[PDB]
Write an enzyme that holds these catalytic residues in place. Structure first.
Site, mmCIF file in Angstrom:
data_model
loop_
_atom_site.group_PDB
_atom_site.id
_atom_site.type_symbol
_atom_site.label_atom_id
_atom_site.label_comp_id
_atom_site.label_asym_id
_atom_site.label_seq_id
_atom_site.Cartn_x
_atom_site.Cartn_y
_atom_site.Cartn_z
ATOM 1 N N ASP A 39 0.825 -1.202 0.000
ATOM 2 C CA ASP A 39 0.000 0.000 0.000
ATOM 3 C C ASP A 39 0.866 1.263 0.000
ATOM 4 O O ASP A 39 1.819 1.361 -0.779
ATOM 5 C CB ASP A 39 -0.935 -0.024 1.212
ATOM 6 C CG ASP A 39 -2.190 0.822 1.009
ATOM 7 O OD1 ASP A 39 -2.141 2.061 1.215
ATOM 8 O OD2 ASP A 39 -3.240 0.232 0.672
ATOM 9 N N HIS A 69 -3.233 5.688 4.324
ATOM 10 C CA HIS A 69 -4.059 4.591 3.836
ATOM 11 C C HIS A 69 -3.429 3.240 4.163
ATOM 12 O O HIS A 69 -4.101 2.343 4.683
ATOM 13 C CB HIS A 69 -4.288 4.772 2.334
ATOM 14 C CG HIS A 69 -5.213 3.769 1.716
ATOM 15 N ND1 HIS A 69 -4.849 2.460 1.481
ATOM 16 C CD2 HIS A 69 -6.497 3.882 1.301
ATOM 17 C CE1 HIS A 69 -5.861 1.816 0.927
ATOM 18 N NE2 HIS A 69 -6.876 2.655 0.814
ATOM 19 N N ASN A 161 -13.970 0.662 -5.820
ATOM 20 C CA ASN A 161 -14.979 1.549 -5.245
ATOM 21 C C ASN A 161 -15.748 2.311 -6.323
ATOM 22 O O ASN A 161 -16.109 3.477 -6.150
ATOM 23 C CB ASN A 161 -14.336 2.524 -4.251
ATOM 24 C CG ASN A 161 -13.440 1.809 -3.216
ATOM 25 O OD1 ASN A 161 -13.917 1.001 -2.418
ATOM 26 N ND2 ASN A 161 -12.147 2.109 -3.235
ATOM 27 N N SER A 224 -11.152 -1.032 -0.072
ATOM 28 C CA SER A 224 -9.806 -1.103 0.431
ATOM 29 C C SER A 224 -9.761 -1.271 1.938
ATOM 30 O O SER A 224 -8.741 -1.730 2.461
ATOM 31 C CB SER A 224 -9.093 0.181 -0.026
ATOM 32 O OG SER A 224 -9.711 1.270 0.619
#
Length: 279
Positions: A39, A69, A161, A224
């Site tokens: 990530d 994130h 998403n 996520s």
């Protein structure tokens, strides 16, 4: 074990019903397993990680999470308060810059990194990779995730998403890995969650409280954030010996809460990740 006043997502993955707030889990807690968080990096120094999180690779001037994130996902995988597998090892692979973006080639290099790097780690209970990332369809990104799965790593990827069919997204459209959609606390498909026949499972994805950079916490939403629940669940299940990397996604789907989600489009699985722990 019982964590009172847990984030709703943790309570959901150990419950046959929505609307509870205690997370129940076997105390082994993913001890002896490893989860790679591919990530924006991990703020390893966060007290929630308890020395169990480390950066192992970055493709940028720094290995620190300047975004948050990656830190948030790693916290949902295995932080003491916000994690599914509270004793797993967390390995950060920073393929995404601090804006959260990354080239596919860097993303592909990070996946091949994990497929070799796990031979440098002590993960007797097995290896998981959580990929809370994604872009348009790429057969090269799909094949990198398929290699990582083939190498003996549980790969869990966000479905995306876009509120669309995940067939047009990578690595979500790779069939051999575990593609995860997002659900909210009322057992609705998250309004942003991708869907389709490539999805394997749903995890909690709407308003997920977890670790954030600067040693803080915050609640954010996305497929996520459903992926590290499934990634954490797999490490938990692998430490318990109930499944292996190759069969974790299939196992999780077999043992999931069946038909409990609403607004699931026809042809998409109605399966919600469930550790199926009996206290």
């Amino acid at each position: 074990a019982a964590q009172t006043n847990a984030p709703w997502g943790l309570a959901r993955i150990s419950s046959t019903s929505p609307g509870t707030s205690t997370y129940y889990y076997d105390e082994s807690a993913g001890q002896g397993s490893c989860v790679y968080v591919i990530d924006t990096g991990i703020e390893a120094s966060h007290p929630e990680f308890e020395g169990r999180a480390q950066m192992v690779k970055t493709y940028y001037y720094s290995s620190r999470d300047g975004n948050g994130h990656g830190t948030h996902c790693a916290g949902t995988v295995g932080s003491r308060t916000y994690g599914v597998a509270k004793k797993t090892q967390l390995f950060g692979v920073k393929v995404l810059d601090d804006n959260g973006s990354g080239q596919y080639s860097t993303i592909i290099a990070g996946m091949d990194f994990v497929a070799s790097d796990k031979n440098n780690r002590n993960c007797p209970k097995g290896v998981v990779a959580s990929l809370s990332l994604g872009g348009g369809y790429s057969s090269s990104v799909n094949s990198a995730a398929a290699r990582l799965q083939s190498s003996g790593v549980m790969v869990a990827v966000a479905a995306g998403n876009n509120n669309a069919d995940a067939r047009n997204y990578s690595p979500a459209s790779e069939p051999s890995v575990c593609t995860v959609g997002a659900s909210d606390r009322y057992d609705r498909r998250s309004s942003f969650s991708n869907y389709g026949s490539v999805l394997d499972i749903f995890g909690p994805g709407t308003s997920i409280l977890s670790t954030w950079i600067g040693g803080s916490t915050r609640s954010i939403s996305g497929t996520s954030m459903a992926t590290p629940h499934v990634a954490g669940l797999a490490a938990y299940l692998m430490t318990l010996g109930k499944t292996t990397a190759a069969s974790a996604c299939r196992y999780i789907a077999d043992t999931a809460n069946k038909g409990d989600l609403s607004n699931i489009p026809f042809g998409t699985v109605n399966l919600l990740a469930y550790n199926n722990y009996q206290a």
